[PDB]
Amino acid sequence: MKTGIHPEYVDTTVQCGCGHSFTTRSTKQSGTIVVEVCSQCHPFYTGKQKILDSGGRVARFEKRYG
Template sequence: MKDGIHPAYGPVVFRDRGAGFAFLTRSTMTSDKTIEWEDGNTYPVVDVEISSQSHPFYTGKSRVVDTAGRVERFERRYGSRGKR
């Protein structure tokens, strides 16, 4: 490999705060935030919104998304234009 053209590749903790799940792996991602891991070492931590512990495909549970607010907002903006 050529020197200086590849990003640094090292251990990083990915944390899914919604599911309370974190895992240590290697990645080129970086972060200013750090976390002390189970082995006593400190690693950069990257917060993610969805992981295998919270994604409906892996859990078999569907999440209810609040679309009522979006529908009501749409009706307020555009609902009266189509009525005659």
């Protein structure tokens, strides 16, 4: 690494909404970062819901009734 052409570095605590906490290095000088996703893949549930959201023939029938 060079002398000072890069930003500073300091410990960083990343706290999530559900209560989870991570510790890692970053560039934020505040030392604490609030995030909206914990160590759990909400992507999984989002995909599980939107794979069901699909469907056009079932919708046409569900509307048809006859």
